[PDB]
Amino acid sequence: LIVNVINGPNLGRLGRRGGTTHDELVALIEREAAELGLKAVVRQSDSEAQLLDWIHQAADAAEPVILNAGGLTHTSVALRDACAELSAPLIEVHISNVHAREEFRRHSYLSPIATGVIVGLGIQGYLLALRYLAEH
Amino acid sequence: LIVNVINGPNLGRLGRRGGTTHDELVALIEREAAELGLKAVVRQSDSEAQLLDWIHQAADAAEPVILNAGGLTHTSVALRDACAELSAPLIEVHISNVHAREEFRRHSYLSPIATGVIVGLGIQGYLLALRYLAEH
Amino acid sequence: LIVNVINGPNLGRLGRRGGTTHDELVALIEREAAELGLKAVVRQSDSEAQLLDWIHQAADAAEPVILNAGGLTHTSVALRDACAELSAPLIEVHISNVHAREEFRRHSYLSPIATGVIVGLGIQGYLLALRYLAEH
Amino acid sequence: LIVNVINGPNLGRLGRRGGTTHDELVALIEREAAELGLKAVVRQSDSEAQLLDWIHQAADAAEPVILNAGGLTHTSVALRDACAELSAPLIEVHISNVHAREEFRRHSYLSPIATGVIVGLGIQGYLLALRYLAEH
Amino acid sequence: LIVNVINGPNLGRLGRRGGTTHDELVALIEREAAELGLKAVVRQSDSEAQLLDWIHQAADAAEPVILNAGGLTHTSVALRDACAELSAPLIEVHISNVHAREEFRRHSYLSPIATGVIVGLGIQGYLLALRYLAEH
Amino acid sequence: LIVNVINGPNLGRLGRRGGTTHDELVALIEREAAELGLKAVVRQSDSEAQLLDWIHQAADAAEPVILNAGGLTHTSVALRDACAELSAPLIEVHISNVHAREEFRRHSYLSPIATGVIVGLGIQGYLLALRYLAEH
Amino acid sequence: LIVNVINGPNLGRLGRRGGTTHDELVALIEREAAELGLKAVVRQSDSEAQLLDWIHQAADAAEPVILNAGGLTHTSVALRDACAELSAPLIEVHISNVHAREEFRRHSYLSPIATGVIVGLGIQGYLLALRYLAEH
Amino acid sequence: LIVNVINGPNLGRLGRRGGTTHDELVALIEREAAELGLKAVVRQSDSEAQLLDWIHQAADAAEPVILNAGGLTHTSVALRDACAELSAPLIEVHISNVHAREEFRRHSYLSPIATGVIVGLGIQGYLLALRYLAEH
Amino acid sequence: LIVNVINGPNLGRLGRRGGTTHDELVALIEREAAELGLKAVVRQSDSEAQLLDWIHQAADAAEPVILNAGGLTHTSVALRDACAELSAPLIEVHISNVHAREEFRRHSYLSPIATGVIVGLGIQGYLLALRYLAEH
Amino acid sequence: LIVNVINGPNLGRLGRRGGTTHDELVALIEREAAELGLKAVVRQSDSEAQLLDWIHQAADAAEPVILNAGGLTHTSVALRDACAELSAPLIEVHISNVHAREEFRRHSYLSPIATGVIVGLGIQGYLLALRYLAEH
């Protein structure tokens, strides 16, 4: 079973002003996925249109999605509407605790339609979302 | 290393109008904890004073806490202030997706001071919080 | 058929700075219930945990509840969540007109899930709730 | 002693898209009133001016009023100001539970000046208001 | 098939301080309706009670309604509740663009229960609503 | 006279989880336009930058625009500012009734500067906007 | 004359992560009270029901109360309603400056019914409240 | 050690429509200060500029300030910014309980930057602030 | 009987970018007052402290005040508190219609404590306030 | 051409708890103005009435104004109304970035009527406003 891990704007800057980089995150995820018997496809883009295309492809293939949409979490109705079409689980992930920062970060257009949300557990949040999905 | 799992009001009614009961949840947690090399102490109370006493004891022993405070999450400043004393990690857990329900459930007094928050992954949320803590 | 009448915080102070006392209220209710062919069990507590235990017992026995939760009406999500499990009717009662006082008293976490609400009719509000329940 | 029962807009559509009709409601009320030794005058109008005239006549005769103002409950300051002149009791009645519906229905211009409010007990709400008034 | 066109307060002042008058609007609508094979009944009143009576008659006959309620759009819950009974389509029409004016005009109690809303297309809005209804 | 029909994000997913597809919508529009003596150019993009380029080209050519901006309706000030330059009519269209859904969908940055808005009439909303424009 | 000093939730943790402990605070208060010719009864509880019982006993004996309700200051209507019965002075005390912290701490259900409020003067706030009461 | 007591607008009207006058208040303060071994300089002005000059002089001399700014408490950012420069303690005093009056009086621009706030204890509030400062 | 007419900030700029000047306004008022048998004392200041001193002198002499406080109407609690001491009538006057301008101008701290308010009638507002006061 | 530079409350405290003083700022401005061929008149006052008099004199002479009103920026409608009379440019200046501080500092009554606003560039903000004005 294939799981899409989709990272949104500014996530390619991970580790570069907390040192895990985006390439390292990809390697960590693929290794964990292989241990669980899953195939993880990890993609990152700063373009909202590109993220919508990837979600549409996950919706047509009925594949689960682990999404960290970055700043678009708080602002894009178009992203929420694309994610409303998914039929497999959608897990929203944030690396840092979004509730401990500015007040505008406490509102997400994605949380109400996600199956679950994991915030503040660092990069381990992606690995735990994978384990939830492997345990069906 | 000892981990406290503290369940608040109405969580002793789990499975009784989704059938996992609170006794079953305790057994699941203890089994997972033993596999990870941890000892889990699982307690549940409908009394806010009893929850504060348990958090104070976790703060003095410097032990991590996985807390599902039920309805007190949204209403108790006293619980938040007791949890502000903890020095080990605090993970807030909700079984259902609190963001997909009434608007008052989207505000938590605990999230801003927790290390991380896990919502909507069912009872597996407690087992993933344990794994995060076992991986230091 | 058994009806639970549950009074919350400060209701044991009735009549003591309008002179009906809580013991008198109990006698009035039991007398009316007997005239209607019902058995009324009247209980009062200043403890939120004790009120939740009584509601849980009413939910397991499928018995109707007439509840005057006092100040907890406006503040407790935990009480609302316990009352959401009841399968028989739930009537919320307030002795005074809560809409004629401070603005925070006009919001109730219980009204939206109650079958009906009776406010401002004094102690007669409890006796009319009994009559509604006797007339199925 | 005479009691006015005043129904506002859309209440003549009762039972017609829960089958009690407005004529049936009138018969039920008159029968209950006669059993209590009262005379009930039941009137219904979709016109706000007509409702104000009836309230003014109740204010000059010092007679109690049981009012279900329909949608005007939430919107008319003119109705509230006419009802502020009454010297006998004013009971506001709603057949359905107004707190379980849209958020604008939770605000009433009438509740703060009514003696009491009864919501959600169906047509029995009118019969219980009569009993309160018969028991002075 | 009969379509009711109902105009609310101040719409009899059309063209009189943009010169189409209400009589001209009626002629335009009847001519368009005849071309489509429909019969249009156009009525106008400044009285809210009269509008409610006309909507009740449309609800009992199951006929579609094209409604321009004027200022009552923003203020009347009673009108919304009468329109909630209709079983055929309800199209809300505004001649001018209500979103380009005062902020209170951007809220309508009718839009959420209408089948569709047409704003800002002048008198042609009524003719396009007719065409939608003729094309079932 | 040329009319631009511009569809924004997620509108290429029409008919695919109500079965009209985007290709079918294009065919329907071109056929109606030809019957009216107009030429319709229908374009769709999930990219906000691409939509702004198309609006800028409509502004320089002084051509009318029928726009369904999808989720960007509620969130993009940049789209509103590009549309503020148009000199020919701008009709905003929504297929479903945006007022009957989430509260954030009731606010549009486009409505206040559009000539008119058509919501809830399905795909027929685009065909009626064409007819308005053909009747100058 | 007897003065009750009542400390609410988390105040038994004073000095333990500013080193005055709750036992030391009690000794300081009793010593100051004896110098003023008063008897101070100092009690602390994390239980809201226990605090309400102590306030009810102060109301029946007509004794003054110096209250630091901790987090319940901001959340409990039941505590405010018990304190509304007191006939002798009620002084609300906070050790730290509640106005310099989170915005939710700036609202107190107790201040409007207290005789006076003292915030930010550390433990000396309790000793100054005693002096106010000794000077009648 | 010198303590400045600064009274703002309308405080020279004390006792004149509760009979202590401003001259009497000055005498009371000077007497208490002398008993504590302090020198109190008491000044009053209805001019905001004059109050700012006095605060600037207290900031340059590093002297403590007891301030009752009257109505300026709720409205002047300029006064708050002058008081933000003080390095010795700043105690805000109100004679009456500001939380029991109009809602606009519950917001103070000064409280968040003051060391402590004393409200509702009458003129004794100034004497207790002096004692706090004498006990360093 | 003496009437004070007090003009606040920027009112000495009347007629100078509607040509009545402040000197002309004074002459108009004195002439009207003499016709009514009253003596009008007209004063203007841009200083809030000076306005408070004049109101205090009107309060001690029990004389009526016609006040146009300019921008201080919307911002000064200190002015409202000085005016709360007056025992003779207080009429608030605005030359232009304050409700037809910016939204912040629709809130006045003075209106709730004034005997009456006159807005939008130009300079004639002062002359009509005089006539009201002459007719006791 | 003469330019007025007007500094409001607390700006005479510049450099005194970032060391430029107000006298140094005056020297810097006069030197820059002379290099540009302008004459700068720099004045500072803690009195709102004095600032209004200076603005009135700038309005009668049609001279440009560079204003740093300090805390009055956020609170004075009277200052805004005096500045609304200016016919030459009005540049509002803040030395620090007002948007990075408390939320009340993000609202200015002056910005909407100023020609331009410069914030956060330190004392150089005044020198750049001069250059804008020298380049007409």
Side-chain angles (χ1 to χ4, degrees), chain A residues 1-16 18-136, chain B residues 1-16 18-136, chain C residues 1-16 18-136, chain D residues 1-16 18-136, chain E residues 1-16 18-136, chain F residues 1-16 18-136, chain G residues 1-16 18-136, chain H residues 1-16 18-136, chain I residues 1-16 18-136, chain J residues 1-16 18-136:
Chain A
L1 104 91
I2 299 176
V3 166
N4 299 289
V5 177
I6 299 176
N7 282 329
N10 297 320
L11 280 142
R13 307 286 294 170
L14 279 177
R16 295 108 83 153
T20 307
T21 61
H22 193 267
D23 290 333
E24 275 166 8
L25 173 62
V26 172
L28 280 166
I29 289 167
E30 292 172 330
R31 184 177 72 181
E32 184 86 359
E35 299 182 11
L36 303 159
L38 303 172
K39 182 170 172 176
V41 174
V42 187
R43 331 196 113 134
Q44 187 275 323
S45 179
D46 280 353
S47 175
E48 175 185 57
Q50 178 65 71
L51 300 171
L52 299 181
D53 176 49
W54 291 335
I55 287 160
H56 298 334
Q57 290 174 39
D60 287 340
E63 296 168 343
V65 171
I66 293 170
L67 172 67
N68 179 342
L72 295 183
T73 310
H74 316 296
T75 64
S76 179
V77 176
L79 185 49
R80 179 207 184 91
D81 288 345
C83 290
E85 290 189 336
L86 294 169
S87 61
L90 168 65
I91 296 168
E92 174 185 358
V93 167
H94 293 271
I95 291 166
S96 76
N97 184 345
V98 292
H99 299 288
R101 295 179 71 195
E102 305 90 330
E103 176 176 25
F104 57 82
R105 293 200 198 263
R106 302 196 64 179
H107 168 259
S108 163
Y109 280 106
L110 298 182
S111 304
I113 61 162
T115 305
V117 185
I118 296 170
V119 140
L121 302 180
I123 250 93
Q124 300 286 338
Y126 292 91
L127 310 175
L128 301 170
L130 278 174
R131 183 169 305 270
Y132 173 81
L133 291 172
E135 273 134 45
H136 302 144
Chain B
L1 104 91
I2 299 176
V3 166
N4 299 289
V5 177
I6 299 176
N7 282 329
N10 297 320
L11 280 142
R13 307 286 294 170
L14 279 177
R16 295 108 83 153
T20 307
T21 61
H22 193 267
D23 290 333
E24 275 166 8
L25 173 62
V26 172
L28 280 166
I29 289 167
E30 292 172 330
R31 184 177 72 181
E32 184 86 359
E35 299 182 11
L36 303 159
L38 303 172
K39 182 170 172 176
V41 174
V42 187
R43 331 196 113 134
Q44 187 275 323
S45 179
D46 280 353
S47 175
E48 175 185 57
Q50 178 65 71
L51 300 171
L52 299 181
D53 176 49
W54 291 335
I55 287 160
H56 298 334
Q57 290 174 39
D60 287 340
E63 296 168 343
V65 171
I66 293 170
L67 172 67
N68 179 342
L72 295 183
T73 310
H74 316 296
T75 64
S76 179
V77 176
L79 185 49
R80 179 207 184 91
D81 288 345
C83 290
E85 290 189 336
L86 294 169
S87 61
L90 168 65
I91 296 168
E92 174 185 358
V93 167
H94 293 271
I95 291 166
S96 76
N97 184 345
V98 292
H99 299 288
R101 295 179 71 195
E102 305 90 330
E103 176 176 25
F104 57 82
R105 293 200 198 263
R106 302 196 64 179
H107 168 259
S108 163
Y109 280 106
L110 298 182
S111 304
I113 61 162
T115 305
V117 185
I118 296 170
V119 140
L121 302 180
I123 250 93
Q124 300 286 338
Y126 292 91
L127 310 175
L128 301 170
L130 278 174
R131 183 169 305 270
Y132 173 81
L133 291 172
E135 273 134 45
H136 302 144
Chain C
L1 104 91
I2 299 176
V3 166
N4 299 289
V5 177
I6 299 176
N7 282 329
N10 297 320
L11 280 142
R13 307 286 294 170
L14 279 177
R16 295 108 83 153
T20 307
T21 61
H22 193 267
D23 290 333
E24 275 166 8
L25 173 62
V26 172
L28 280 166
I29 289 167
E30 292 172 330
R31 184 177 72 181
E32 184 86 359
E35 299 182 11
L36 303 159
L38 303 172
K39 182 170 172 176
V41 174
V42 187
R43 331 196 113 134
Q44 187 275 323
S45 179
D46 280 353
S47 175
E48 175 185 57
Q50 178 65 71
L51 300 171
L52 299 181
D53 176 49
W54 291 335
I55 287 160
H56 298 334
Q57 290 174 39
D60 287 340
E63 296 168 343
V65 171
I66 293 170
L67 172 67
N68 179 342
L72 295 183
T73 310
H74 316 296
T75 64
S76 179
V77 176
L79 185 49
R80 179 207 184 91
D81 288 345
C83 290
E85 290 189 336
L86 294 169
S87 61
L90 168 65
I91 296 168
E92 174 185 358
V93 167
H94 293 271
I95 291 166
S96 76
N97 184 345
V98 292
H99 299 288
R101 295 179 71 195
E102 305 90 330
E103 176 176 25
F104 57 82
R105 293 200 198 263
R106 302 196 64 179
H107 168 259
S108 163
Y109 280 106
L110 298 182
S111 304
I113 61 162
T115 305
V117 185
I118 296 170
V119 140
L121 302 180
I123 250 93
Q124 300 286 338
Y126 292 91
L127 310 175
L128 301 170
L130 278 174
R131 183 169 305 270
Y132 173 81
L133 291 172
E135 273 134 45
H136 302 144
Chain D
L1 104 91
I2 299 176
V3 166
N4 299 289
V5 177
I6 299 176
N7 282 329
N10 297 320
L11 280 142
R13 307 286 294 170
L14 279 177
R16 295 108 83 153
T20 307
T21 61
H22 193 267
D23 290 333
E24 275 166 8
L25 173 62
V26 172
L28 280 166
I29 289 167
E30 292 172 330
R31 184 177 72 181
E32 184 86 359
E35 299 182 11
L36 303 159
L38 303 172
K39 182 170 172 176
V41 174
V42 187
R43 331 196 113 134
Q44 187 275 323
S45 179
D46 280 353
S47 175
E48 175 185 57
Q50 178 65 71
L51 300 171
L52 299 181
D53 176 49
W54 291 335
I55 287 160
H56 298 334
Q57 290 174 39
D60 287 340
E63 296 168 343
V65 171
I66 293 170
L67 172 67
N68 179 342
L72 295 183
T73 310
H74 316 296
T75 64
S76 179
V77 176
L79 185 49
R80 179 207 184 91
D81 288 345
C83 290
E85 290 189 336
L86 294 169
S87 61
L90 168 65
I91 296 168
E92 174 185 358
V93 167
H94 293 271
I95 291 166
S96 76
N97 184 345
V98 292
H99 299 288
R101 295 179 71 195
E102 305 90 330
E103 176 176 25
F104 57 82
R105 293 200 198 263
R106 302 196 64 179
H107 168 259
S108 163
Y109 280 106
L110 298 182
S111 304
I113 61 162
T115 305
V117 185
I118 296 170
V119 140
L121 302 180
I123 250 93
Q124 300 286 338
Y126 292 91
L127 310 175
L128 301 170
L130 278 174
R131 183 169 305 270
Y132 173 81
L133 291 172
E135 273 134 45
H136 302 144
Chain E
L1 104 91
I2 299 176
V3 166
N4 299 289
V5 177
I6 299 176
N7 282 329
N10 297 320
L11 280 142
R13 307 286 294 170
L14 279 177
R16 295 108 83 153
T20 307
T21 61
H22 193 267
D23 290 333
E24 275 166 8
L25 173 62
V26 172
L28 280 166
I29 289 167
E30 292 172 330
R31 184 177 72 181
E32 184 86 359
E35 299 182 11
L36 303 159
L38 303 172
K39 182 170 172 176
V41 174
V42 187
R43 331 196 113 134
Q44 187 275 323
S45 179
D46 280 353
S47 175
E48 175 185 57
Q50 178 65 71
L51 300 171
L52 299 181
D53 176 49
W54 291 335
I55 287 160
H56 298 334
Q57 290 174 39
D60 287 340
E63 296 168 343
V65 171
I66 293 170
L67 172 67
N68 179 342
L72 295 183
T73 310
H74 316 296
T75 64
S76 179
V77 176
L79 185 49
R80 179 207 184 91
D81 288 345
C83 290
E85 290 189 336
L86 294 169
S87 61
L90 168 65
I91 296 168
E92 174 185 358
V93 167
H94 293 271
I95 291 166
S96 76
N97 184 345
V98 292
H99 299 288
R101 295 179 71 195
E102 305 90 330
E103 176 176 25
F104 57 82
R105 293 200 198 263
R106 302 196 64 179
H107 168 259
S108 163
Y109 280 106
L110 298 182
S111 304
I113 61 162
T115 305
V117 185
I118 296 170
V119 140
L121 302 180
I123 250 93
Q124 300 286 338
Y126 292 91
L127 310 175
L128 301 170
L130 278 174
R131 183 169 305 270
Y132 173 81
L133 291 172
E135 273 134 45
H136 302 144
Chain F
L1 104 91
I2 299 176
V3 166
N4 299 289
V5 177
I6 299 176
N7 282 329
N10 297 320
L11 280 142
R13 307 286 294 170
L14 279 177
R16 295 108 83 153
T20 307
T21 61
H22 193 267
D23 290 333
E24 275 166 8
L25 173 62
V26 172
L28 280 166
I29 289 167
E30 292 172 330
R31 184 177 72 181
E32 184 86 359
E35 299 182 11
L36 303 159
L38 303 172
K39 182 170 172 176
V41 174
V42 187
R43 331 196 113 134
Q44 187 275 323
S45 179
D46 280 353
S47 175
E48 175 185 57
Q50 178 65 71
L51 300 171
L52 299 181
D53 176 49
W54 291 335
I55 287 160
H56 298 334
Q57 290 174 39
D60 287 340
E63 296 168 343
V65 171
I66 293 170
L67 172 67
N68 179 342
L72 295 183
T73 310
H74 316 296
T75 64
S76 179
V77 176
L79 185 49
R80 179 207 184 91
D81 288 345
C83 290
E85 290 189 336
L86 294 169
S87 61
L90 168 65
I91 296 168
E92 174 185 358
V93 167
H94 293 271
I95 291 166
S96 76
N97 184 345
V98 292
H99 299 288
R101 295 179 71 195
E102 305 90 330
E103 176 176 25
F104 57 82
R105 293 200 198 263
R106 302 196 64 179
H107 168 259
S108 163
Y109 280 106
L110 298 182
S111 304
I113 61 162
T115 305
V117 185
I118 296 170
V119 140
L121 302 180
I123 250 93
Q124 300 286 338
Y126 292 91
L127 310 175
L128 301 170
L130 278 174
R131 183 169 305 270
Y132 173 81
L133 291 172
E135 273 134 45
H136 302 144
Chain G
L1 104 91
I2 299 176
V3 166
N4 299 289
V5 177
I6 299 176
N7 282 329
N10 297 320
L11 280 142
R13 307 286 294 170
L14 279 177
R16 295 108 83 153
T20 307
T21 61
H22 193 267
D23 290 333
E24 275 166 8
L25 173 62
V26 172
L28 280 166
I29 289 167
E30 292 172 330
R31 184 177 72 181
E32 184 86 359
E35 299 182 11
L36 303 159
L38 303 172
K39 182 170 172 176
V41 174
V42 187
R43 331 196 113 134
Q44 187 275 323
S45 179
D46 280 353
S47 175
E48 175 185 57
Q50 178 65 71
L51 300 171
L52 299 181
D53 176 49
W54 291 335
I55 287 160
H56 298 334
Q57 290 174 39
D60 287 340
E63 296 168 343
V65 171
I66 293 170
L67 172 67
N68 179 342
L72 295 183
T73 310
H74 316 296
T75 64
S76 179
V77 176
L79 185 49
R80 179 207 184 91
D81 288 345
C83 290
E85 290 189 336
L86 294 169
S87 61
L90 168 65
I91 296 168
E92 174 185 358
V93 167
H94 293 271
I95 291 166
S96 76
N97 184 345
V98 292
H99 299 288
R101 295 179 71 195
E102 305 90 330
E103 176 176 25
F104 57 82
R105 293 200 198 263
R106 302 196 64 179
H107 168 259
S108 163
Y109 280 106
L110 298 182
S111 304
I113 61 162
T115 305
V117 185
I118 296 170
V119 140
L121 302 180
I123 250 93
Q124 300 286 338
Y126 292 91
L127 310 175
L128 301 170
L130 278 174
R131 183 169 305 270
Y132 173 81
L133 291 172
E135 273 134 45
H136 302 144
Chain H
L1 104 91
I2 299 176
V3 166
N4 299 289
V5 177
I6 299 176
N7 282 329
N10 297 320
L11 280 142
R13 307 286 294 170
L14 279 177
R16 295 108 83 153
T20 307
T21 61
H22 193 267
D23 290 333
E24 275 166 8
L25 173 62
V26 172
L28 280 166
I29 289 167
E30 292 172 330
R31 184 177 72 181
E32 184 86 359
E35 299 182 11
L36 303 159
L38 303 172
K39 182 170 172 176
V41 174
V42 187
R43 331 196 113 134
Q44 187 275 323
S45 179
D46 280 353
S47 175
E48 175 185 57
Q50 178 65 71
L51 300 171
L52 299 181
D53 176 49
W54 291 335
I55 287 160
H56 298 334
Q57 290 174 39
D60 287 340
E63 296 168 343
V65 171
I66 293 170
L67 172 67
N68 179 342
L72 295 183
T73 310
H74 316 296
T75 64
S76 179
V77 176
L79 185 49
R80 179 207 184 91
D81 288 345
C83 290
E85 290 189 336
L86 294 169
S87 61
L90 168 65
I91 296 168
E92 174 185 358
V93 167
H94 293 271
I95 291 166
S96 76
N97 184 345
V98 292
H99 299 288
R101 295 179 71 195
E102 305 90 330
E103 176 176 25
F104 57 82
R105 293 200 198 263
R106 302 196 64 179
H107 168 259
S108 163
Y109 280 106
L110 298 182
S111 304
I113 61 162
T115 305
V117 185
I118 296 170
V119 140
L121 302 180
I123 250 93
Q124 300 286 338
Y126 292 91
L127 310 175
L128 301 170
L130 278 174
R131 183 169 305 270
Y132 173 81
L133 291 172
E135 273 134 45
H136 302 144
Chain I
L1 104 91
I2 299 176
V3 166
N4 299 289
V5 177
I6 299 176
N7 282 329
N10 297 320
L11 280 142
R13 307 286 294 170
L14 279 177
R16 295 108 83 153
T20 307
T21 61
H22 193 267
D23 290 333
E24 275 166 8
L25 173 62
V26 172
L28 280 166
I29 289 167
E30 292 172 330
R31 184 177 72 181
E32 184 86 359
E35 299 182 11
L36 303 159
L38 303 172
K39 182 170 172 176
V41 174
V42 187
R43 331 196 113 134
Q44 187 275 323
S45 179
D46 280 353
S47 175
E48 175 185 57
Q50 178 65 71
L51 300 171
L52 299 181
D53 176 49
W54 291 335
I55 287 160
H56 298 334
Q57 290 174 39
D60 287 340
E63 296 168 343
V65 171
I66 293 170
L67 172 67
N68 179 342
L72 295 183
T73 310
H74 316 296
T75 64
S76 179
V77 176
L79 185 49
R80 179 207 184 91
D81 288 345
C83 290
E85 290 189 336
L86 294 169
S87 61
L90 168 65
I91 296 168
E92 174 185 358
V93 167
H94 293 271
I95 291 166
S96 76
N97 184 345
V98 292
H99 299 288
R101 295 179 71 195
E102 305 90 330
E103 176 176 25
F104 57 82
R105 293 200 198 263
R106 302 196 64 179
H107 168 259
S108 163
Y109 280 106
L110 298 182
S111 304
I113 61 162
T115 305
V117 185
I118 296 170
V119 140
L121 302 180
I123 250 93
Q124 300 286 338
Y126 292 91
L127 310 175
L128 301 170
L130 278 174
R131 183 169 305 270
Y132 173 81
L133 291 172
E135 273 134 45
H136 302 144
Chain J
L1 104 91
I2 299 176
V3 166
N4 299 289
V5 177
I6 299 176
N7 282 329
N10 297 320
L11 280 142
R13 307 286 294 170
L14 279 177
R16 295 108 83 153
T20 307
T21 61
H22 193 267
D23 290 333
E24 275 166 8
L25 173 62
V26 172
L28 280 166
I29 289 167
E30 292 172 330
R31 184 177 72 181
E32 184 86 359
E35 299 182 11
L36 303 159
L38 303 172
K39 182 170 172 176
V41 174
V42 187
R43 331 196 113 134
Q44 187 275 323
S45 179
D46 280 353
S47 175
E48 175 185 57
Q50 178 65 71
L51 300 171
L52 299 181
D53 176 49
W54 291 335
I55 287 160
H56 298 334
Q57 290 174 39
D60 287 340
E63 296 168 343
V65 171
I66 293 170
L67 172 67
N68 179 342
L72 295 183
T73 310
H74 316 296
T75 64
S76 179
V77 176
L79 185 49
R80 179 207 184 91
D81 288 345
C83 290
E85 290 189 336
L86 294 169
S87 61
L90 168 65
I91 296 168
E92 174 185 358
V93 167
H94 293 271
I95 291 166
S96 76
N97 184 345
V98 292
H99 299 288
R101 295 179 71 195
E102 305 90 330
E103 176 176 25
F104 57 82
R105 293 200 198 263
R106 302 196 64 179
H107 168 259
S108 163
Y109 280 106
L110 298 182
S111 304
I113 61 162
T115 305
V117 185
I118 296 170
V119 140
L121 302 180
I123 250 93
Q124 300 286 338
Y126 292 91
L127 310 175
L128 301 170
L130 278 174
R131 183 169 305 270
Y132 173 81
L133 291 172
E135 273 134 45
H136 302 144

